Ligand binder design. Structure first.
Ligand code: NAG
Lengths: 210, 229
C-alpha cells in the first residue's frame, strides 16, 4: 500500500496570509490535492503534483521535492478554508484543517458557573455548567473541583467558532454526576486558566444555597 | 456538464444494511468507472472500490471485501453501494466519484474531478429522542457587577441537530449557542447562553426556544432568577 502523511494537522491563519501544507508519500506516483469546505463535497484542486484543475486560481500552487509535496495557497480567501487531503491512487492523507484565526489583543474569559436546575434534579441526574465567555486567544484550560477534589472523566467541553465581530471565543464545560453523588458534596468549583489571567480563576457555589 | 446525483443521508442501527445510489448525467454512463469514497470527520478518507457500468466488473478495498456490494442499473445511469453488518465505525459521509479523463475510447480513474454531494450515514444504537430543556438561571454566581449570564441546557437528544433561539429570534446579541457534545449514553447534549445587563433581570423576560425536528418536539422554557423569599 501507499502511505501518505500530511502536516501539520491544523493550520490557523487570517485571510490574506498564505497557507503551506505538506504530504509525504511512500512511493513515486501522481499526487493530487482536494479541498473540503465545511459541510461540502471535496473538490479537486491540483493533480500530478503541480497541475491546477479547471477554475482554480493561480493562488494555489503545488511543488515537489522527491517524496515531499507542498500545497501553497496564497492570499487566503474565506472560501479557501476547510480541510485539505492529498491522494495517490487508492490512498489518502489524513487531512489538514486550514481554519481562520484573526488576531486581536488578549481578552481574559468571563467565568460563570451554573448549578443543576431543580427540574433536572427531580430526575436522577445533575449537570453543572461552567461558561467561559468572550476570550482570546482560543487556548484555555478548565478544571472541575468538588470539595477541592480534582475531577476527571466526568466532564465534556465545547468551544464556539471565533466571533465574526469581536474575534473572541467562548467555551462551555459540563460536569455530569448522578443526583446521589451530587448530594454527597458541598462545593462545586470551576477553575480557569488563560493567558489573559494573571493567575487561575475559580467560580464556586455551595449545594442547596439560593 | 458532467454531474453525479446522490440519494440522501440515512440512519441505521448496528447490524443493519444500507443502499446508497449515485446517478450520472451529462456524459455516457458506460464509459467510466464509478468510485465510492467515505469521509469520517477527523479520519483518513477511505476509497471503498470502483464499479464499471459496462460489464459490472468490480474492485473493492481489502477491508470491505465480503461485506460490500456494488451494482449499477444501466436503464437509469445509476450506481449502487450496499454495505452490510454495519457498526458505528461505518459512520461517515459516503461520496461517489468519477475520474477526470473519460471519453468513448479511454479513461483514467484516479484524478477525482467529479464528486457527488455526499450521503451522510450515521450508525448508532440510539433511537431518536426529544431533548430535555433545563434552565441555566442567572444569580450572584453569574452577575459580574453590571452584566449577567443565563442560558438553557438541552440534554439527552438524538439525533442532531436542534435549533435554539431566544425570544423567538428577537434576542440575538451576546448569544452563544454551543456545539453539541456526544455522551456515553449515545445521546447528544448542548447549551445555549446569553449575557445581558443584570439590571434587566428584574424587568426583561428571557425565553429560550428549542426545536428538535427529528422527534418533532418544540419547547419554550422560561429562564428567570431563582426566587429567594
Ligand atoms: C514545504 O512546506 C513545509 C511546511 O511549511 C516548509 O517548511 C518547507 O520549507 C517547504 N519546502 C520548501 C522547499 O520550501
Amino acid at each position: 500500500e501507499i502511505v501518505l502523511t500530511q502536516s501539520p494537522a491544523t493550520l490557523s491563519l487570517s485571510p490574506g496570509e498564505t497557507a503551506i501544507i505538506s504530504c509525504r508519500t511512500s512511493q513515486s506516483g501522481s499526487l493530487a490535492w482536494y479541498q473540503q469546505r465545511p459541510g461540502q463535497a471535496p473538490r479537486l484542486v491540483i493533480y500530478s503534483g503541480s497541475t491546477r484543475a479547471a477554475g482554480i486560481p493561480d493562488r494555489f500552487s503545488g511543488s515537489r521535492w522527491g517524496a515531499d509535496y507542498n500545497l501553497s495557497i496564497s492570499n487566503l480567501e474565506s472560501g479557501d478554508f476547510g480541510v485539505y487531503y492529498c491522494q495517490q491512487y487508492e490512498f489518502f492523507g489524513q487531512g489538514t484543517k486550514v481554519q481562520v484565526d484573526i488576531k486581536r489583543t488578549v481578552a481574559a474569559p468571563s467565568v460563570f458557573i451554573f448549578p443543576p436546575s431543580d427540574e433536572q434534579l427531580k430526575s436522577g441526574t445533575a449537570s453543572v455548567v461552567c461558561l467561559l465567555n468572550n476570550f482570546y486567544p482560543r487556548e484555555a484550560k478548565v478544571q472541575w473541583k468538588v470539595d477541592n477534589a480534582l475531577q476527571s472523566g466526568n466532564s465534556q467541553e465545547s468551544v464556539t467558532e471565533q466571533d465574526s465581530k469581536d474575534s473572541t471565543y467562548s467555551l462551555s464545560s459540563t460536569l455530569t454526576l448522578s443526583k446521589a453523588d451530587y448530594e454527597k458534596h458541598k462545593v462545586y468549583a470551576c477553575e480557569v486558566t488563560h493567558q489573559g489571567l494573571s493567575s487561575p480563576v475559580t467560580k464556586s457555589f455551595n449545594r442547596g444555597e439560593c | 456538464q458532467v454531474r453525479l446525483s446522490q440519494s440522501g443521508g440515512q440512519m441505521k442501527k448496528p447490524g443493519e444494511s444500507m443502499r446508497l445510489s449515485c446517478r450520472a448525467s451529462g456524459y455516457e454512463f458506460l464509459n467510466c468507472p464509478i468510485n465510492w469514497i467515505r469521509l469520517a470527520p477527523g479520519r483518513r478518507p477511505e476509497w471503498m472500490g470502483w464499479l464499471k457500468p459496462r460489464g459490472g466488473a468490480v474492485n473493492y478495498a481489502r477491508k470491505f471485501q465480503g461485506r460490500v456490494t456494488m451494482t449499477r442499473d444501466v436503464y437509469s445511469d445509476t450506481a449502487f453501494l450496499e454495505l452490510r453488518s454495519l457498526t458505528s465505525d461505518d459512520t461517515a459521509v459516503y461520496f461517489c466519484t468519477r475520474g477526470k479523463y473519460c471519453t468513448a475510447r479511454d479513461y483514467y480513474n484516479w484524478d477525482f474531478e467529479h464528486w457527488g454531494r455526499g450521503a451522510p450515514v450515521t450508525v448508532s444504537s440510539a433511537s431518536t429522542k426529544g431533548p430535555s430543556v433545563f434552565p441555566l438561571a442567572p444569580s450572584s454566581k453569574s452577575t459580574s457587577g453590571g452584566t449577567a449570564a443565563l442560558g438553557c441546557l438541552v440534554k439527552d437528544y438524538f439525533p442532531e441537530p436542534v435549533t435554539v433561539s431566544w425570544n423567538s429570534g428577537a434576542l440575538t446579541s451576546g448569544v452563544h449557542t454551543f456545539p453539541a457534545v456526544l455522551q456515553s449514553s449515545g445521546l447528544y447534549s448542548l447549551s445555549s447562553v446569553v449575557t445581558v445587563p443584570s439590571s434587566s433581570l428584574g424587568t426583561q423576560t428571557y425565553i429560550c426556544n428549542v426545536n428538535h425536528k427529528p422527534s418533532n418536539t418544540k419547547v419554550d422554557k422560561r429562564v428567570e432568577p431563582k426566587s429567594c423569599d
